[PDB]
Design a protein around this ligand. Sequence first.
Ligand code: 58D
Ligand code: 58D
Ligand code: CL
Ligand code: CL
Ligand code: NI
Ligand code: NI
Lengths: 288, 288
Amino acid sequence: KSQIPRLSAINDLHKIWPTVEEHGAAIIESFLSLDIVRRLNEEVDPFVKIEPIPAAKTKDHPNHILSTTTRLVNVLAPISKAYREDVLNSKVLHRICSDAFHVYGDYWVLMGAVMELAPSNPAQPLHRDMRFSHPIVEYLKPDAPATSINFLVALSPFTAENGATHVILGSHKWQNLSNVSMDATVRALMNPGDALLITDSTIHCGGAETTGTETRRLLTITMGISQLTPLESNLAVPRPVIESLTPLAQRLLGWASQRSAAPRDIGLLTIRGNSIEKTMNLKAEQPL
Amino acid sequence: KSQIPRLSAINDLHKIWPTVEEHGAAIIESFLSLDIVRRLNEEVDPFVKIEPIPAAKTKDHPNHILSTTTRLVNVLAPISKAYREDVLNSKVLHRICSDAFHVYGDYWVLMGAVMELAPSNPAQPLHRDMRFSHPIVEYLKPDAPATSINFLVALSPFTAENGATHVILGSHKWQNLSNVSMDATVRALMNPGDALLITDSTIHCGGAETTGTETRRLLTITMGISQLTPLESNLAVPRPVIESLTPLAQRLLGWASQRSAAPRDIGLLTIRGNSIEKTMNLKAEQPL
Ligand SMILES: COc1ccc(C[C@H]2C(=O)Nc3ccccc3C(=O)N2C)cc1
Ligand SMILES: COc1ccc(C[C@H]2C(=O)Nc3ccccc3C(=O)N2C)cc1
Ligand SMILES: [Cl-]
Ligand SMILES: [Cl-]
Ligand code: NI
Ligand code: NI
């Protein structure tokens, strides 16, 4: 069985989305530089350490799906300069997203999260993303272009023994799911900064951590059309932080109006014919 | 040909959504009281008068579809006490919406707008709503439950001669649109406070104003699943105004997290497992 296609962020940029459209997955080698990975890790480190269990009794939106040995930290913009500057303005990410979502229009971040898997973390069941948040997605026609995609960026090594992600190539086109099995999977073996890109229809799962010693960390960036509601809110992010961002980063975090691809688009999140950013006089690229 | 079913807001409440599901339209008699209509009208009056043309060159999200003799005012919460208190907490609206959207989960306001049509306003072409903002909707399967519905509330009389809305009954189930014609329509003749309820698949249009003297006004409330992005933003609505609302009204305006109907729902617009309202310590029902 064939392995996940591996592509250069530098050289093969136009090939990335077409590869994912055909095969359901691709590995983007050095999607983030080692420097960006270093800074991201350093900045999110304490927030991962203080994060409670996914279904903590203190939470009013507990995640009952993730293993108790998973820590997920989202709303990364206030935590991480590297995320809000380097990642949110990634040339590679934006080329891929504009390739993927041109039929629909603007896209934004549905969720940007750091996930840390503890040693001995079990494999997840094979799944498609979005089914615990967006029931609408299951009602889309088979040939509907993907309305979200997920960049699974390695922040530490992904190996077969420490639980590297499994994917079933071609499974994004499957209607009948009788042949869903771990027998059909291949692995996303990745160095820090490499990213596995999948669609919302790609069948996949986190792998089993079998060493009992290694802690695997990733940055999962679910990008989706601006017509779908994000899993996370940036409403509470301080205005100085938002005003330090590029206009593009502001749009990605829901601090701007959005546009569809309809020929005479009337827009999303508008205010009496004007944008959020025009109405609120929102500044951009103002240093803290 | 059969007329639009007419139902009591008081007596026939459980019958309203089933009627719309079957026929694609229903008239809810006295959906709003005359007092609520009076107050709504008085409060929005000046904002309608100052509103420029839909495609005004000053706007960065111009509406190129609406006639130049239409004035549309959205983001009504800061304008109208009657809207944000009486309409957003309407028992009838919420019963209908929970009936309609139970398969998907929470719902919210995609757009609440007052539309005023000037004398001699031409009939709109027959259409389905949502096609200039949510291209995703066209890619839903035929049997997908409606993901949005539109309450067209009369704020002045709707008569055949002054441009009362046309609908084609049953057209919400149409796949082939070869028989789309004004020959197939019936009219929504309505007194102030009556509402025509349609789905996002009901084929309909505003009628021709033929008197040259009458100004027709309506309140259009597009309610949709919380998984779809609103056409309008309440991000710039002052916090004192938001904190005067009920928790339900806050949710409807995007000042709360949202939930899907998935058995182990992980939520929408959350912040590290907690809600917007918990995170921001958002007060409710605090008088101005
Ligand atoms: C333990 O087995 C699992 C089964 C299904 C899922 C799906 C997933 C999702 O739909 N979206 C995301 C996307 C990014 C990060 C986390 C999640 C997330 O929480 N779930 C539930 C996760 C785990
Ligand atoms: C002039 O002919 C027309 C053709 C189509 C439409 C559709 C409509 C929409 O999709 N949504 C709404 C919903 C509530 C109020 C206004 C609108 C709105 O602006 N358009 C464009 C309007 C007019
Ligand atoms: Cl994984
Ligand atoms: Cl109308
Ligand atoms: Ni997944
Ligand atoms: Ni319409």
